[PDB]
Structure formats: structure tokens, C-alpha cells
Amino acid sequence: MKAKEIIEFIETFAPKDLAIEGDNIGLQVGDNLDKEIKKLGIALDPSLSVIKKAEKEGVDFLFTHHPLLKDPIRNFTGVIYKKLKILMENDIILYSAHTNLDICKNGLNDALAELYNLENPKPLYDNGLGRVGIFKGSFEEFLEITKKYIHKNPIVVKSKEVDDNFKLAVLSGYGLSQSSIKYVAEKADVYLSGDLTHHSKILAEELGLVVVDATHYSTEVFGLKKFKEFLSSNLDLEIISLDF
Amino acid sequence: NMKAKEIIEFIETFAPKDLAIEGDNIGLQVGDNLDKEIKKLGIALDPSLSVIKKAEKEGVDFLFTHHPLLKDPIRNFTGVIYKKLKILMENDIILYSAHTNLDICKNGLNDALAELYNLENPKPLYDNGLGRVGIFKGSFEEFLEITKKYIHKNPIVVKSKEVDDNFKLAVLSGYGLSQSSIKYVAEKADVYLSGDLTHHSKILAEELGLVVVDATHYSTEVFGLKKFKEFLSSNLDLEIISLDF
Amino acid sequence: VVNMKAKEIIEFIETFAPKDLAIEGDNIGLQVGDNLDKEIKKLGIALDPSLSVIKKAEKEGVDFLFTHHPLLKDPIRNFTGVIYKKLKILMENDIILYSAHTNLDICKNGLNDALAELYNLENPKPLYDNGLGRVGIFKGSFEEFLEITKKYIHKNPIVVKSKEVDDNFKLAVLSGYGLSQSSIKYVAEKADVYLSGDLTHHSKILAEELGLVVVDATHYSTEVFGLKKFKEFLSSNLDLEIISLDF
Amino acid sequence: NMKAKEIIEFIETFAPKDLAIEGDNIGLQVGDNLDKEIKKLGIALDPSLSVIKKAEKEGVDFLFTHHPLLKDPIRNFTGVIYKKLKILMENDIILYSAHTNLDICKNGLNDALAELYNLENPKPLYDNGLGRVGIFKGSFEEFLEITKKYIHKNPIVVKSKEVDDNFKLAVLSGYGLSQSSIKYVAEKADVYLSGDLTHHSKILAEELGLVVVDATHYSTEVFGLKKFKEFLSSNLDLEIISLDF
Amino acid sequence: EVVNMKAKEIIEFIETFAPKDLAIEGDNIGLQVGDNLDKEIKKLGIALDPSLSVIKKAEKEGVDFLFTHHPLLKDPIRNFTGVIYKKLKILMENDIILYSAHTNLDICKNGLNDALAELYNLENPKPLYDNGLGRVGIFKGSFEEFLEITKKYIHKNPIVVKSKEVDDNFKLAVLSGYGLSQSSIKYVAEKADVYLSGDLTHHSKILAEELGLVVVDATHYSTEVFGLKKFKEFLSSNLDLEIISLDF
Amino acid sequence: NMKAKEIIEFIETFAPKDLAIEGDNIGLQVGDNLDKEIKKLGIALDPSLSVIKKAEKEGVDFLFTHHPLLKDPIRNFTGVIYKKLKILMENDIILYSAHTNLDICKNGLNDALAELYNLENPKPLYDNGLGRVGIFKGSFEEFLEITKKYIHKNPIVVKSKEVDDNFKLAVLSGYGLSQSSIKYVAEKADVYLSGDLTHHSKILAEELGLVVVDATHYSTEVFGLKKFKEFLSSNLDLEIISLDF
Numbered sequence A: 001m002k003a004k005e006i007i008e009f010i011e012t013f014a015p016k017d018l019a020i021e022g023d024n025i026g027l028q029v030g031d032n033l034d035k036e037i038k039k040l041g042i043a044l045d046p047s048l049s050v051i052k053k054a055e056k057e058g059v060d061f062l063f064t065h066h067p068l069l070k071d072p073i074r075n076f077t078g079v080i081y082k083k084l085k086i087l088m089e090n091d092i093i094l095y096s097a098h099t100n101l102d103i104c105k106n107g108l109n110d111a112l113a114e115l116y117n118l119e120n121p122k123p124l125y126d127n128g129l130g131r132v133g134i135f136k137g138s139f140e141e142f143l144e145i146t147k148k149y150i151h152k153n154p155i156v157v158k159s160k161e162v163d164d165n166f167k168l169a170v171l172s173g174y175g176l177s178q179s180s181i182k183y184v185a186e187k188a189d190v191y192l193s194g195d196l197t198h199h200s201k202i203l204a205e206e207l208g209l210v211v212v213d214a215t216h217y218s219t220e221v222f223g224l225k226k227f228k229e230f231l232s233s234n235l236d237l238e239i240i241s242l243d244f
Numbered sequence B, D, F: 001n002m003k004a005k006e007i008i009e010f011i012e013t014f015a016p017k018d019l020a021i022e023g024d025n026i027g028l029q030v031g032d033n034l035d036k037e038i039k040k041l042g043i044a045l046d047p048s049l050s051v052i053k054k055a056e057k058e059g060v061d062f063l064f065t066h067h068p069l070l071k072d073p074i075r076n077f078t079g080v081i082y083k084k085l086k087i088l089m090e091n092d093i094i095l096y097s098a099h100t101n102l103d104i105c106k107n108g109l110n111d112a113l114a115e116l117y118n119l120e121n122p123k124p125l126y127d128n129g130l131g132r133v134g135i136f137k138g139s140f141e142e143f144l145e146i147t148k149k150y151i152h153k154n155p156i157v158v159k160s161k162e163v164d165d166n167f168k169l170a171v172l173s174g175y176g177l178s179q180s181s182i183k184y185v186a187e188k189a190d191v192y193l194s195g196d197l198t199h200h201s202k203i204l205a206e207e208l209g210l211v212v213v214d215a216t217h218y219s220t221e222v223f224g225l226k227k228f229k230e231f232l233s234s235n236l237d238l239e240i241i242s243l244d245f
Numbered sequence C: 001v002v003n004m005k006a007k008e009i010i011e012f013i014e015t016f017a018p019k020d021l022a023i024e025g026d027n028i029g030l031q032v033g034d035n036l037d038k039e040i041k042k043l044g045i046a047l048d049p050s051l052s053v054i055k056k057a058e059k060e061g062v063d064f065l066f067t068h069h070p071l072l073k074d075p076i077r078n079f080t081g082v083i084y085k086k087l088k089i090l091m092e093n094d095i096i097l098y099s100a101h102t103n104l105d106i107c108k109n110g111l112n113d114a115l116a117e118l119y120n121l122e123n124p125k126p127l128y129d130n131g132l133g134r135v136g137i138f139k140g141s142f143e144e145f146l147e148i149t150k151k152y153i154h155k156n157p158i159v160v161k162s163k164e165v166d167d168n169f170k171l172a173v174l175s176g177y178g179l180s181q182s183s184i185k186y187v188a189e190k191a192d193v194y195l196s197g198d199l200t201h202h203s204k205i206l207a208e209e210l211g212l213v214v215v216d217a218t219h220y221s222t223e224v225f226g227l228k229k230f231k232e233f234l235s236s237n238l239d240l241e242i243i244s245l246d247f
Numbered sequence E: 001e002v003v004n005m006k007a008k009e010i011i012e013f014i015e016t017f018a019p020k021d022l023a024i025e026g027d028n029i030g031l032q033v034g035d036n037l038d039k040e041i042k043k044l045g046i047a048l049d050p051s052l053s054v055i056k057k058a059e060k061e062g063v064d065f066l067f068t069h070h071p072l073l074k075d076p077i078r079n080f081t082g083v084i085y086k087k088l089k090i091l092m093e094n095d096i097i098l099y100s101a102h103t104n105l106d107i108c109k110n111g112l113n114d115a116l117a118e119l120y121n122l123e124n125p126k127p128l129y130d131n132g133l134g135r136v137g138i139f140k141g142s143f144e145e146f147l148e149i150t151k152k153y154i155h156k157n158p159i160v161v162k163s164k165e166v167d168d169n170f171k172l173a174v175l176s177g178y179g180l181s182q183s184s185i186k187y188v189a190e191k192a193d194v195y196l197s198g199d200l201t202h203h204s205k206i207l208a209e210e211l212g213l214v215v216v217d218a219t220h221y222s223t224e225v226f227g228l229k230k231f232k233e234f235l236s237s238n239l240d241l242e243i244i245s246l247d248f
């Protein structure tokens, strides 16, 4: 397969126009997209160690969920220099699907909704991010699923008691901003996401929203693993994971 | 028999308001007549709803907090903010905050951390005076043991590289672990002690080789806030209690 | 005469003056309040949520305070001085404060319609694109228009008589503050005479240059005319004691 | 006798342009050759169309106004501004303004008001130098009588509270009655004399207990402008007339 | 059979050919200087620029209505001194109307860009930019023939940035006026082999060389005046009015 | 045996980075390890693709340019910038720029022009230090002949007016012929020597009566850049070649 064909397949699953405004999705680093691809690597982050591992494992198409850069730059030194040097010197293509992969059908948020078997799931935000629906079971059962499948030691902000058959909101990645807490508190009893910080914990306690931080990494890697299986099943291509 | 304005004078002598960084909402949060006599002072990290309820329950007349009531301004009064204000106003509880001016001032929250680790030749970490950095005269393991004994029993350690003895330690009380902070501090220190670590910042520290120790936002401020509470208790003839620590 | 829940009063008011009619950025709706199941015995109406209005509301046992102007235009993050005094009174008495501002200016039979109907404007149209103000032909003389103004709105309006006004002229009306320099420039292309409130020096000079006759019947009176109509409307439909506080 | 540039130098010695507040469009409004000989100088508050027509009718060569011709810039020349510019350009009448620099300078428009009321220990009201404030050594009624005799016969008085003798009086020539000004001045004075009162500012003054006297924008400026005109007449051998006062 | 027209009739005619809503966002088109548009017009003058020398020549020649492609001012002002004072004074004391059709004249059918596309007989021309500016299509011939046309009809010594060899039947982009900004070079490199426009500067030359876009600078003036002459001929054919050109 | 950081130190001593105007992207463009030993330094006006290819071909390990690689920041790497970065990174070629700091410094690109024309009592043209202006002690024709001999054989001359002997000459290396520059310099000089003339600026200069001589952006910079190259060659024991001049 050619790089552009891999990109075509991925964009059919996760169309770029589903990405939220300003999200740096698509080609991160690359020039010739007609090149035949020897090995595909999948990672959450285009980190320096991921990129070093890509070169070591002979990966020539590196797919990541997070973009290489959010903020644009005009000097190339330090860590970004080391990263670009490896990608360019080895002609490794770097391509990202970020919020388009969060939002698309069977994408990262759908993977969470399906894991918890949410009843009548809907998008949490108007832009399509996150899912919300009824968890048909006890709070304890929800926690066991979280601990078994996502993360063993989640932070639980137990802001109030949770009855059976509650509204569960899920957001893969960083969903625990203060403004998100305020928003989700109007829509759900429990909010499962990642990257909890102090001010957001206090706000959830005030609003009575139960928050479960199963970490940014794990709430995304759960769906990313499913995405990797989908690619492996459909493409005649060697595919490896680099930071999971 | 102290007046609210005299408590405010005492606090602002320790932590002058002009030390606060641009835009920080410090000073009087809620209150009108500052000639009011104050019988009981409450100290808290956060002006949360539960802290404010506890203040009312305990007969607190002056509520001092590190964090301001609001960061972003509002023009409607409903829900939680309505509930908070209602309690403060019907009890005429004054709410007053010292935030980054208390981080930055001499013997404030960052100085308290610097003194705990006995930093050699300490300097402000940032140009605006936030944080401290200097040499820790000992091993990484000794630095960790101090952290576990006095700050947080189990901090997250991002061990991005090996750390030699007599290393450069930067400390910042509260939330110091933004991505831009990681990048900045990596140029100034081997080890960075602060709070509120998140994923992108963890990855960035590993790339840069900066060892990051997250002893939490709460604990890295409450360490110094307890010192500030003792300082107030020693100098003021006033009943003083802590509400969320 | 019975008691209503606050949410029922709000629902009625918003059917008359829908919130989506408000112009961009206008702070309309709930100003101060939490539980809208609160039972309401006495509804108070005011132009302004002033300190004296709020004191009178407390004094008169008002449970629901409706005002045309919002409590705050610019948001705040400290609560001291006057705003402290106002909120303390409202919160201690759990008085709900609710506002309908430009949505009440713009809606059918709202404040601007009330003026257009008073002057019996022929073929009235909205004055601005956002629906604010009204303009049409006044079927009469300038003096007849002034006497109507004097009888119903304000007895001694300031008249900037920029030119002679012939019978059957184009009259623009805007309830409240409609006399900014940019408004004078805009309305000068649309009307012979502009009736509104809050005239200041640079706007007077500008009107004289443009030949636009301006009548300042005051911000207060040009809104209160329609606010009285609104109060009568509520009194006719709601079984509630309803009082006016600053008019 | 005199060239325009000499008239300008004299005015700018009295009211230096660097006194004008940021963004104020002061100085040469319309003109090219400043060596032009000037026989007749006209002074006006506003560079209005009727003032400019009168300048042309009276053979004015140099038109001085307090207010600038334009606050906001334009890139098309039609309607009233076309009419104004055509009269000035076709007659090579120079139009020059001193606006807030004339408000702020020593013996300028605000100083003229301070001196009329014989304010004790006067200070600038704002940090940028606008307005004056000091003690009025007399009763409220005496202050009002001075106001009515020398400034405007029927000022609007917002009597927000009782005013005792020897009160703090703030004065600002022109438009000083914005909401943000009311809030500011309420901290500094018992009584505020200025112009261009509107509804929201009246309500706010009542809430704050600030007594406000609107003696109008026009009259509170023209008082000092008449003084300025006499000063010019005393010092320049030039025919000098006033156009809108 | 030469008569006087009212200014508003001239404006109506021009705006029928080049409607104001074709002008790009922010473009200062329409009436520049003037008040009464019932003014009777005996002599219409056409110019590229409302320069001081053009306005002086207009006054000298008794022009009553001055039409220019470029607006008098792009950026607004609030003081009237120096050159703009000199210009406005001449226009106002003589009550000469100044009116401009700028990008609406660039974009309209048979406007300045179409005139270039037609001169090069572009095959299947399309607007170069989405807002309608410029034209692009196939030049059915050799690069050398394209050059000969350029030299004969537009400008005798055009600057050629020969970034690569150009084969016959290439994609030719044209933009009348200043089309050679860096952002334009980048954009057009994706759409054409050759870019004919005006006002080349150093950074743009380097960028064109990097991208392999052949750029031909036939000057800002000449790439617009070619079409402006057509426009003047069009007016002369349709209005029974004396019409002269002032800076061409 | 000299290190990249030592080359950079030498250059920044001559042209300190703090002389660069606000926002100018000067300093290290591409590079990581500045302890690297440098065997061959290349000097160029532009970090163009052809310059960078030539640098690789000639074995240049330190590439110095006047113009920065990027003015506007990017967050994707494709096309031409990909090709350029790849060549630099795969060969570990350092790219370093001194832009307006080299324009402004003593004996920098603008001083070099001022010295060529032997300007009398030269001063900076702009407040930020850009450009130079002073008296040319000779005729306009003598000035043109110097230009033709040393800078550019055939400069564009916009002869807006006649020029008397001993006129005021302003020089600015590179692109100095913006419309706002034309307006500014017309107040300070009779003749303006710079580069990159476009139509609107030509018209404006004719209106103002400012004589403009466009000796091209490239040539007015390369003149001083050659001087800078000789200065480096005279002081550093290093192979130094020029790449686009």
C-alpha cells in the first residue's frame, strides 16, 4: 500500500471535517505520499521516545492520535529538532487523527460508550465530543468495569451518592476542565474522563457531579487499541503499537 | 475586638497586594463595611461552598482564602454562586483573598517550600517572582523522603533521568506544571516539585529530561498556608481556625 | 387573587417577549435567583434595578422584581459597595430579580410598538436591522406631534429644530437611549423627526448639521410609557398583586 | 503681522500637545502652508458646519476650535464633511484644535472652573490631569448661585444627599458624567460639576450619594474658552472673534 | 451629438458594467469625493491613479467627472494636510467628482482580468481566486509565443523569473495589478505553470524559484492599463460624452 | 578547531541580538548541539532551497544568512520547508541568522552604505536604528556614479524633482520602499536609496517630490554583507565562502 491509500482508508473511518475547529489533524510531516509503506506504527503521542522507537522498528508511516504541534513555531531546536531529524532523515510519514477520531462512529468516545453499554447514547457536546447515556447497573459495577478495562486506580470524586441506572457521561482524553465540569453537571450524574486537577475537583464537589479520572492516557488507549485491531483486520500491512 | 480593616492591614503588610501578578483577583472578595469588629477568623485554601457553609456553622466573621472567589467575572447570580453569596451576605461574613501575593512574598508559600528543602542560594524561579530554585544539598532519595514526610505521602514521580546529588531543585506551590512551565523550568532545574500534573506535561518532561514531582496542588500550598496560619495566630489576639485543612 | 410560582410568571413574560428577540450581548433573563418554584404573592415592576427600587421592593413585600434594565451590563468578580448592598437585600429576602430588556423593546406591543401606536404611525417598520425602534409617516403637523408628545410622554421635551417640518413627515421613534452620534447619522437618512431620549452636546450639533429634527422626551419617559402598558397587560392576565416601583 | 505657525507656537506654549490624552486628535486639522499670514482669528467650541460658514462669512483666516473636526478617521468625502472641507480649503482657512491639552494645562478650562469656585488646595481629579477637585469654602447654595450666575442659569441638580458647608467639589469641563466617571468621582468628592448627564449616570449618582450638577457640556467649556480668548487678545495683535459663543 | 450627462447616470452605467457587490471585502469603491450627483458632466476623465499630477491635469483639462481604478485612500484619515490637502482642494474648489471602480472592475465580465485572459486567448478560463480575482487557463502555444504577446501588447521588457522549463500548452495565470505577493506566489504555484502579473519584489522572486513557478512581471501599471484602455473604449462607444485619459 | 557557539558569540558581539527590531526572528533557526566543531562556514543573503542545497554540496556545516528561514510560524512540515529542513537536519548543518541586528549595528549593512557615500554627520534614519541619513557632499550625478560602480549597474531612478548639490541622502539596505516609509523619509531627505520599489510607492514619491533610487533589495544588502564576510575572514581562522553572492 501507498501512504495516500492508508490515509484514504483512515479518513473514510474518521473524516477530517469531523475535527473540531482549529484541531491540527492530517499530515504532520511528510512529502511524497505515493511511497509504498513498509510498516505502520500507531501511537497515542508523537513523543521523542515513540519516534525513536519508530526508527528502531523500521516504521515508515507513524500514525498518532495527538498532533505533533498545537502551537506553530518558526525555529527548530532542542526536542523538536531531534524529532524532525529522525522523521526526515528516515522519510517517515507522520499523520494524525485527533478529534475526528474522538467523534467518528466507533471512534474513541463510542468505544467508551460501548464498554459501559450505555443505554440510548447521545453526543455529550454539540460538536460531537463525548457520549452520555444510562448506565444500567450500580455505581459499584461501573467502577469494576473501569478498574478492569481502563485503569486500576482511578481517582473518584464522590460528590454525592449515586443511585442505580444513573446518567453516565464519557469523554476520552482531557474532559475535566472547569467549563466541562460545569457543562456536564447539567447532563449527567457521573463523568468519566481524564486529567483531573484541583480546581475542577472542587467545582465538581460543589455541583454534586461525581467525577472519575481514569487518566487521559488510558481513556484514549482503550479506543486506540480497538482502532489498531480494525486497521489490522482490514489492511494487508504490518502494524505495531509504539507507546501502548 | 479587632476590626476587619486591621486584619487586612496586617495581612497586606506580610503580603503586599502589588506583589500579585497582573490580573490576579486579590483583596476584598465580598464585603462592605470594614470597620466591622471580627471575633473569629477562618482560613481556607478554597472559598468552596462547603468551606463557606462550614464558616457559617462555626461562627466565622472573616473568611480568608488563598484562592479568589471568582477568576472570571459574571453578571448573573444563580446556582452555586448564588448559594455562596447568600451565606456570606446574610451573615455579613467578609471574604478576603491573598493569592499570588502570598505565593511570592517573603516567607510566603514558595519560600516555605524553599526553606523546607533548605535550598542553597535560592532565587525566584520566574521573573514575576513566582516559585524558587536553588541547590538541594543532598541526594534525590533524601529529597523524596523529605517530600513524603512533610508534603505528600505518595507523590507522582516522573523520573525523566537519573539525578545526581547536589542537584538544582525548583519548587512552585500550587499549579506549576503547565506545558509552558515545564519547558521553562527544564532550562533552570534538574527536579521540579509542584502540583496538578497532566498527560501532555508528563510527556513533555520526559522528552526534556526534567524530573517532575507532583505532590499535588493542595498539599504544596497547604504546607505554607499552615505556616501562615501559625504566623497569624502568634501575632493576632483572635480566634483563628482552618476550614479545609 | 392567588399566588403564582416564579417559573410561571417567567413563562408568561417570555411568551410576550421571547428572549431570542434580545439583541446580541444583551443581559436579559434571570438576574438574581435560584429556586424558581418560589411562590409569588406580589410582583414589582421597575425601569431600573436601582438601590432605592430594591429597598422599596423589600419594604413593600415584593417577591418577584421585574425590571427593564439588567442589574449589570459589565460583569464583575468582586462584591462590595452598592452591588453588595443590593444583593444582600435580594438574597436575604430571596427576592427574584428578572429582566426583559431589548426583547421587550422589540416584541409586538413592546416599548417601541407602544410609541409607534401612540403616534399612529402609518405603515410602521423597524428602524434598525436588529428590530430596534420604529419609523413611519406621522399623518399630521409637527405641532400635532409635539402636543401628543407633551400629553402622553413628557411635558417639556428638548427640541432640536434643525429644519422646518412639513405635514405628513417621516417620524422615527426609539424608546430609551436612541440619541448616540452613530444613531443620529443613521436615522438622518431615514426620517425627518427622531423622538428618543438622552441627548448630549455632540449629538445635538450633529443633528443640526444633518437637518435631523430631534426630540428628547427623556430616556425615562419614553420607556415608562410602554412599561405602564406592559404592567396593565400583566395586571389583566395575572391574578397577582402587581405594583410599580420607580414609576 | 502674524503667520499661522506663530499663532500655533503661542497656543502650544500655553497648551503643549504632549498634555493631550492618548488618542486625542489635537493640532492641525485642515491646512497646508503654515507661513500663511493671518489677519483674523476665530475661536469656537465646535468646528460645526454653521461655525465654518460663519468663519467664511466673517473673513476668518485661522479657525481655532476646542473640539477636533473628526474623532474617527474616514476615507470618503461626501455630505456634511465635504461641505465643511470645501469651505475651508477653497478659502485656505486653517483649522487648528487644542482639545484635552487645553482642558489640562495650567489656567486651562478645568483650572478656570477651579478658580471660579475658588477651590481650596486644588488637585487634578484624574491621573491624566483631567478635571480638578478641592474644598468649596461655603454652602451648597452659594456654590449653586455661582453656578447659575457664571455658568448656566438652570443646571440639572441630582441632589443625591444633603451637602454640608465646606464640601469637596470636583469639576470637569465638558463631558464628565459617564458612568465610570461617576463611580470614580464618588470616591473623591461630595459634589461633581460637569456636563452631558444621561439616565444611567443619574441613577448611579443617586445610588452612590454623589451630588451631580449638569451645567451642560457647552457652558462648562465655554466659560474657560472665553478666558482663553481674552488671553489671546491680550497677547496677540490680531483681530479675534468668537463664533459659537 | 456630444452632450452633457448627469453624474448619477454615468455612475449607473459604470455600475451596470461593474457592480459594486463584485468588489472584495474592504475595498473602497464608489464615490470618493463628491456631494451633488445631479451635477451635469461635460467631460469625463479616466485614470489609473488619483495622483496629484492626475488631479492637476484633470483641473487643467476641464474634467468634471474623474474616474480612477485605484481609490483615493485605502487607509482612513482624520487630518487634512500636505498632499491630500492639495488634492482635495483642487477637487472641491472645482467641484470635480472623484469616483472609483477597483476590484469590481478587476472581476466583472470583460473587466481587467478578462481583458488579459482574452489577450492570451486562454482555453477554458476560470477565476484564479475564489473571490473572483485573476484568471487561469491553458495557453495554447509555446512559452516564447506567450512572451512575444506580452512584449507586444503589455510591456516591452518584462522581468522573467524562469524557475523551470515551460512546455507548450501550459497553465497560465494572470492577475492585473499587484498579484505577486508571497502568499499569492504560494497559492498560484499550485494552480499554474506561469504567473503573469505586476510588482515583483525580492522575497517573492526567491519563493517563485523555490516552488518552480515561472513569474513574469509586466508591471502593475501596464497589466491594468491594458484593460483600462478597453474600458475607456467601451465607455466612448456607449456614452455620447467627451472622454479623455489622464495617466495613460 | 572552533565551535558553533564561538562563531555565534563572535557574530553577536558585532551584532548584538538586542539591536534587532521587535518581532524579528533572529538567532538560531535550525540546530541543536552548539558545541559541534565547524570546519566550513557559508554566508548567504537568503536561506533559499538552492542556497541550502549548495551548502550541502560544498560541505558547509554552519550556514549564516541575513534573512531568517521563516517569518510566519508553522505547525505542519511538507513541500519546500520539508525539503529544506531535511537537508539541514540530515547533514547536521546549523542555520543561524542575523537580520535587523546586522542592519542596525555599527559597521553593519546600513553603516556600510553610509560610509560608501561618505555621508556627512550621519544619523539613524528611523528611531529603531534602521537606515542612515546625512549630507551627500557632491552632485546628484556623482552619487549616481558611485551607485552604479559599487552597488548596482542600472538602478531605477524616480526623479521626482531636481536635486541640488550637497543634498540630504537617506539609505536603507533591503526593502525600504514601503508607502509608509516613502512618507516618513520624504520629511527627512531629498534622495532615498533602497530596494524593492512597487507602483504605489513610486506614485507617492512623485507626489511628495522625494527622489527614489531603487538599487534593488539584493544589491543594497549584499554590499555590506560582503564587508561582513571580509570582517569574519580577517578575524576567524575558519574557511568561509559565500553562497548566493
Ligand SMILES: [Fe+2]
Residues within 6 Å of the ligand: A066, A172, A173, A174, A216, A220
Ligand atoms: Fe488526548
Ligand SMILES: [Fe+2]
Residues within 6 Å of the ligand: B067, B173, B174, B175, B217, B221
Ligand atoms: Fe493554587
Ligand SMILES: [Fe+2]
Residues within 6 Å of the ligand: C069, C175, C176, C177, C219, C223
Ligand atoms: Fe433604557
Ligand SMILES: [Fe+2]
Residues within 6 Å of the ligand: D067, D173, D174, D175, D217, D221
Ligand atoms: Fe467637550
Ligand SMILES: [Fe+2]
Residues within 6 Å of the ligand: E070, E176, E177, E178, E220, E224
Ligand atoms: Fe492596481
Ligand SMILES: [Fe+2]
Residues within 6 Å of the ligand: F067, F173, F174, F175, F217, F221
Ligand atoms: Fe532584506
